Amino acid sequence: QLHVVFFPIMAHGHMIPTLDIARLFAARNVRATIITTPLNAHTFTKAIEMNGSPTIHLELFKFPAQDVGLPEGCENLEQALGSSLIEKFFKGVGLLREQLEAYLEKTRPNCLVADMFFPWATDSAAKFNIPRLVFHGTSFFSLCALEVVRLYEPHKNVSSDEELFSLPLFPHDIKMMRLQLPEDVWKHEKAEGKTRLKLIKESELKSYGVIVNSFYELEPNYAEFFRKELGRRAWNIGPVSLCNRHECLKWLNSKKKNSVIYICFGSTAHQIAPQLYEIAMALEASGQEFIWVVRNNDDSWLPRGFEQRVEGKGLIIRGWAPQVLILEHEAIGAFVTHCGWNSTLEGITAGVPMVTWPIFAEQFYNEKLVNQILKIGVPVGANKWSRETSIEDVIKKDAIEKALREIMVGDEAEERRSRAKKLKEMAWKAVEEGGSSYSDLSALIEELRGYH
Ligand SMILES: O=c1ccn([C@@H]2O[C@H](COP(=O)(O)OP(=O)(O)O[C@H]3O[C@H](CO)[C@@H](O)[C@H](O)[C@H]3F)[C@@H](O)[C@H]2O)c(=O)[nH]1
Ligand SMILES: [K+]
């Protein structure tokens, strides 16, 4: 029996897609083991119980939180707040190498699918002649855009923050500004973050190949560009969440089709009260019906009497929303998102246009994919790459209101809903037998069966 070990980093945006990839391999009669940590194991155990479905095994590693100076309870990337904790977090995940090499010698699996943040996992798997696959959890376009920006540095031929530059080599003219790039790369360059990106991008060529959570038909110019111009060996097997298939739902049943906006900013939602306030003011001015998801830890971010003033039109969800069931409801016709790839794929899979609100990571590249290339989105005006949010950087009510109207009744809004409806169909087509993603998932497994 073929055995594949999955080693995601401890971040929700990477753990959930990695689990879905493990389920996909399990459905093809492949033994799948996921490596996690004790305080994260609940995320997988809960999500495994959703049967008669093949069994996915968990292996728990000790996270050296004390060895790197992290709180003992900091085993997840969403608790490492600030620059100091995040650098301590990546020193900690690096110390997992010993447990990984011990586990690889013990079990001797046929393949290691390891997170993009583990470039050294290629060497660790080589000690036992195990091929290593990289998983990023993002689009081909972000993979290509990150690499072209790293190699050609078009941000040095610029003189001011908002001065635009084109992305080299791309089959589309993509305009970007340095302000959308991390200051760690263009302002006060610190070798720490630059060497980590170098090792991550290099591992895509040094390893056996790349698993990509996308489908070929979604971004074919960049599925090819990644393989040919950038020389990577890759397989598009996404959307991986698809082949594994409440009060707010009753609230929507009585609503018009494609007239409600869904607002949710992911699992990494670090939202401050002044920013939530501008969103509340902008939602009121729009007049649009909405489902708004906020987090927890009350009048310090809400206008007085807000919930009661919009009771018949608006709903605020404070817990964990059933995002997939909400977006695929008929009433939902717009999605304000932070352009994380997992939720961007869910917007595409449901055929819902999006208001793009990038914050950090590769979200600004995903915004370009959604707005300029796929043309199913509208920018909100956010263009400042930042891990946390400064009150100086808050997006005001006026920008949010125009984006809420543009996505609902603005120019081409009915064509964007139509374009998203095809992408929806192509997404389900890609994952069924004979589809693009179903096909080279079989091609990856067959290649793994015959690795010498
Ligand atoms: O209230 C809620 C809130 C969330 N969810 C679910 O959590 C997922 C959110 O997707 P998302 O890509 O935004 O995850 P995130 O960790 O923030 O993004 C990082 O990981 C991404 C993957 O690489 C990366 O692209 C990005 O830059 C990173 F920031 C998505 O699958 C939802 O279904 C929910 O069900 N209910
Ligand atoms: K090349």
Side-chain angles (χ1 to χ4, degrees), residues 410-434:
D411 184 17
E412 270 200 272
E414 193 48 56
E415 311 295 317
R416 285 187 292 252
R417 291 186 204 91
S418 189
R419 288 194 287 264
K421 198 177 298 172
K422 281 185 192 196
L423 300 181
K424 164 179 181 180
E425 301 303 318
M426 312 179 86
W428 287 96
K429 263 204 298 183
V431 288
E432 301 156 3
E433 296 176 36

Short mmCIF file of all heavy atoms in Angstrom, two decimals, residues 410-434:
data_model
loop_
_atom_site.label_atom_id
_atom_site.label_comp_id
_atom_site.label_asym_id
_atom_site.label_seq_id
_atom_site.Cartn_x
_atom_site.Cartn_y
_atom_site.Cartn_z
N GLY A 410 -23.04 47.97 -9.72
CA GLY A 410 -22.07 48.67 -10.54
C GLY A 410 -21.93 48.15 -11.96
O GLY A 410 -22.67 47.27 -12.40
N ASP A 411 -20.96 48.71 -12.68
CA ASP A 411 -20.74 48.33 -14.07
C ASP A 411 -20.30 46.87 -14.17
O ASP A 411 -19.45 46.41 -13.39
CB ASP A 411 -19.70 49.25 -14.69
CG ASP A 411 -19.49 48.97 -16.16
OD1 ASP A 411 -20.36 48.31 -16.76
OD2 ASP A 411 -18.46 49.41 -16.71
N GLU A 412 -20.88 46.14 -15.11
CA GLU A 412 -20.59 44.74 -15.42
C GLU A 412 -20.94 43.78 -14.30
O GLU A 412 -20.62 42.59 -14.40
CB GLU A 412 -19.12 44.51 -15.77
CG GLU A 412 -18.79 44.65 -17.23
CD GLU A 412 -17.49 43.96 -17.57
OE1 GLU A 412 -16.42 44.61 -17.45
OE2 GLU A 412 -17.53 42.77 -17.94
N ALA A 413 -21.60 44.25 -13.23
CA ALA A 413 -21.85 43.38 -12.08
C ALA A 413 -22.61 42.13 -12.49
O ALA A 413 -22.40 41.06 -11.90
CB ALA A 413 -22.62 44.16 -11.01
N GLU A 414 -23.49 42.23 -13.49
CA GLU A 414 -24.22 41.06 -13.96
C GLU A 414 -23.35 40.15 -14.82
O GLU A 414 -23.62 38.94 -14.91
CB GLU A 414 -25.48 41.50 -14.72
CG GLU A 414 -26.47 40.38 -15.00
CD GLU A 414 -26.76 39.54 -13.76
OE1 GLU A 414 -27.17 40.11 -12.73
OE2 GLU A 414 -26.57 38.31 -13.84
N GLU A 415 -22.33 40.70 -15.47
CA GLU A 415 -21.38 39.86 -16.19
C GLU A 415 -20.40 39.16 -15.25
O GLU A 415 -20.01 38.02 -15.50
CB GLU A 415 -20.62 40.69 -17.23
CG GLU A 415 -21.51 41.56 -18.13
CD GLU A 415 -22.44 40.74 -19.03
OE1 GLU A 415 -21.99 39.74 -19.62
OE2 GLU A 415 -23.63 41.12 -19.16
N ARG A 416 -20.01 39.83 -14.15
CA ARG A 416 -19.13 39.18 -13.18
C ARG A 416 -19.82 38.00 -12.53
O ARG A 416 -19.20 36.95 -12.31
CB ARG A 416 -18.68 40.18 -12.11
CG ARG A 416 -17.63 41.17 -12.55
CD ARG A 416 -17.17 41.98 -11.35
NE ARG A 416 -18.22 42.85 -10.84
CZ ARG A 416 -18.22 44.17 -10.97
NH1 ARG A 416 -17.20 44.78 -11.56
NH2 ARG A 416 -19.22 44.89 -10.48
N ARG A 417 -21.11 38.15 -12.22
CA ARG A 417 -21.88 37.02 -11.72
C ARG A 417 -21.93 35.91 -12.76
O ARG A 417 -21.90 34.72 -12.41
CB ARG A 417 -23.30 37.48 -11.35
CG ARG A 417 -23.37 38.40 -10.12
CD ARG A 417 -24.81 38.72 -9.71
NE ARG A 417 -24.91 39.97 -8.97
CZ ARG A 417 -25.12 41.16 -9.53
NH1 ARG A 417 -25.27 41.26 -10.84
NH2 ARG A 417 -25.20 42.25 -8.78
N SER A 418 -22.00 36.28 -14.04
CA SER A 418 -22.02 35.29 -15.11
C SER A 418 -20.65 34.62 -15.27
O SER A 418 -20.57 33.39 -15.41
CB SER A 418 -22.46 35.95 -16.42
OG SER A 418 -22.69 35.00 -17.44
N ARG A 419 -19.57 35.40 -15.24
CA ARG A 419 -18.23 34.82 -15.32
C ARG A 419 -17.95 33.91 -14.13
O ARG A 419 -17.37 32.83 -14.29
CB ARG A 419 -17.18 35.92 -15.42
CG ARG A 419 -17.16 36.61 -16.76
CD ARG A 419 -15.91 37.43 -16.94
NE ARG A 419 -15.92 38.64 -16.13
CZ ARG A 419 -16.31 39.83 -16.59
NH1 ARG A 419 -16.70 39.94 -17.85
NH2 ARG A 419 -16.31 40.89 -15.80
N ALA A 420 -18.37 34.32 -12.94
CA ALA A 420 -18.20 33.47 -11.77
C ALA A 420 -19.03 32.20 -11.89
O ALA A 420 -18.63 31.15 -11.38
CB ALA A 420 -18.58 34.23 -10.50
N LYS A 421 -20.17 32.26 -12.58
CA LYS A 421 -20.98 31.05 -12.73
C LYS A 421 -20.30 30.01 -13.61
O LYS A 421 -20.46 28.81 -13.37
CB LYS A 421 -22.37 31.39 -13.29
CG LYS A 421 -23.39 30.26 -13.06
CD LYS A 421 -24.80 30.61 -13.55
CE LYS A 421 -25.39 31.80 -12.81
NZ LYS A 421 -26.68 32.26 -13.41
N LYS A 422 -19.55 30.43 -14.64
CA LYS A 422 -18.79 29.45 -15.42
C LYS A 422 -17.64 28.87 -14.62
O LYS A 422 -17.46 27.65 -14.58
CB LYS A 422 -18.27 30.04 -16.73
CG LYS A 422 -19.30 30.12 -17.84
CD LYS A 422 -18.66 30.61 -19.13
CE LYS A 422 -19.72 30.97 -20.15
NZ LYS A 422 -19.16 31.08 -21.53
N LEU A 423 -16.86 29.74 -13.96
CA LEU A 423 -15.76 29.24 -13.14
C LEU A 423 -16.27 28.22 -12.14
O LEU A 423 -15.61 27.21 -11.88
CB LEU A 423 -15.06 30.40 -12.42
CG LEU A 423 -14.43 31.51 -13.25
CD1 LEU A 423 -13.78 32.55 -12.35
CD2 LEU A 423 -13.40 30.94 -14.22
N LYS A 424 -17.46 28.46 -11.60
CA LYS A 424 -18.09 27.47 -10.72
C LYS A 424 -18.25 26.13 -11.43
O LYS A 424 -17.90 25.08 -10.87
CB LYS A 424 -19.45 27.99 -10.24
CG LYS A 424 -20.33 26.89 -9.65
CD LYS A 424 -21.66 27.41 -9.16
CE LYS A 424 -22.48 26.29 -8.54
NZ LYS A 424 -23.80 26.77 -8.04
N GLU A 425 -18.78 26.15 -12.65
CA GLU A 425 -19.00 24.90 -13.38
C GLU A 425 -17.68 24.23 -13.73
O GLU A 425 -17.55 23.01 -13.58
CB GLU A 425 -19.84 25.16 -14.64
CG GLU A 425 -21.21 25.78 -14.38
CD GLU A 425 -22.08 24.95 -13.45
OE1 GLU A 425 -22.10 23.71 -13.58
OE2 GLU A 425 -22.75 25.54 -12.57
N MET A 426 -16.70 25.01 -14.19
CA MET A 426 -15.40 24.44 -14.52
C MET A 426 -14.72 23.86 -13.28
O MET A 426 -13.99 22.87 -13.39
CB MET A 426 -14.50 25.50 -15.15
CG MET A 426 -15.16 26.29 -16.25
SD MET A 426 -14.07 27.55 -16.95
CE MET A 426 -13.22 26.57 -18.18
N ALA A 427 -14.98 24.44 -12.11
CA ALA A 427 -14.39 23.92 -10.88
C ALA A 427 -14.92 22.53 -10.56
O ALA A 427 -14.15 21.61 -10.27
CB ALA A 427 -14.65 24.87 -9.71
N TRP A 428 -16.24 22.36 -10.61
CA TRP A 428 -16.79 21.03 -10.42
C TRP A 428 -16.39 20.09 -11.55
O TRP A 428 -16.22 18.89 -11.32
CB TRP A 428 -18.31 21.09 -10.28
CG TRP A 428 -18.75 21.64 -8.96
CD1 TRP A 428 -19.11 22.93 -8.68
CD2 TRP A 428 -18.85 20.92 -7.73
NE1 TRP A 428 -19.45 23.04 -7.36
CE2 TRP A 428 -19.29 21.83 -6.75
CE3 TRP A 428 -18.61 19.59 -7.37
CZ2 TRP A 428 -19.49 21.45 -5.42
CZ3 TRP A 428 -18.81 19.22 -6.05
CH2 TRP A 428 -19.25 20.14 -5.09
N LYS A 429 -16.25 20.61 -12.77
CA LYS A 429 -15.82 19.76 -13.87
C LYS A 429 -14.38 19.29 -13.69
O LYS A 429 -14.06 18.15 -14.04
CB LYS A 429 -15.97 20.49 -15.21
CG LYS A 429 -17.26 20.15 -15.96
CD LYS A 429 -17.12 20.39 -17.46
CE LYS A 429 -16.84 21.85 -17.79
NZ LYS A 429 -16.77 22.10 -19.26
N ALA A 430 -13.52 20.14 -13.12
CA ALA A 430 -12.12 19.78 -12.96
C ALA A 430 -11.92 18.64 -11.98
O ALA A 430 -10.95 17.87 -12.12
CB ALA A 430 -11.32 21.01 -12.52
N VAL A 431 -12.81 18.48 -11.00
CA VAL A 431 -12.60 17.50 -9.94
C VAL A 431 -13.28 16.16 -10.20
O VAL A 431 -12.92 15.17 -9.56
CB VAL A 431 -13.04 18.06 -8.57
CG1 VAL A 431 -12.06 19.13 -8.08
CG2 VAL A 431 -14.45 18.62 -8.63
N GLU A 432 -14.26 16.11 -11.10
CA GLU A 432 -14.91 14.85 -11.44
C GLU A 432 -14.03 14.03 -12.37
O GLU A 432 -13.07 14.53 -12.96
CB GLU A 432 -16.26 15.12 -12.09
CG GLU A 432 -17.22 15.93 -11.23
CD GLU A 432 -18.26 16.67 -12.06
OE1 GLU A 432 -18.27 16.50 -13.30
OE2 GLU A 432 -19.06 17.43 -11.47
N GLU A 433 -14.37 12.75 -12.52
CA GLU A 433 -13.61 11.87 -13.41
C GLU A 433 -13.52 12.46 -14.81
O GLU A 433 -14.52 12.90 -15.38
CB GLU A 433 -14.25 10.47 -13.46
CG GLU A 433 -14.24 9.72 -12.13
CD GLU A 433 -14.95 8.38 -12.18
OE1 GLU A 433 -14.86 7.70 -13.22
OE2 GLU A 433 -15.55 7.98 -11.16
N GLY A 434 -12.30 12.50 -15.35
CA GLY A 434 -12.03 13.13 -16.62
C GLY A 434 -11.69 14.61 -16.54
O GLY A 434 -11.22 15.17 -17.54
#
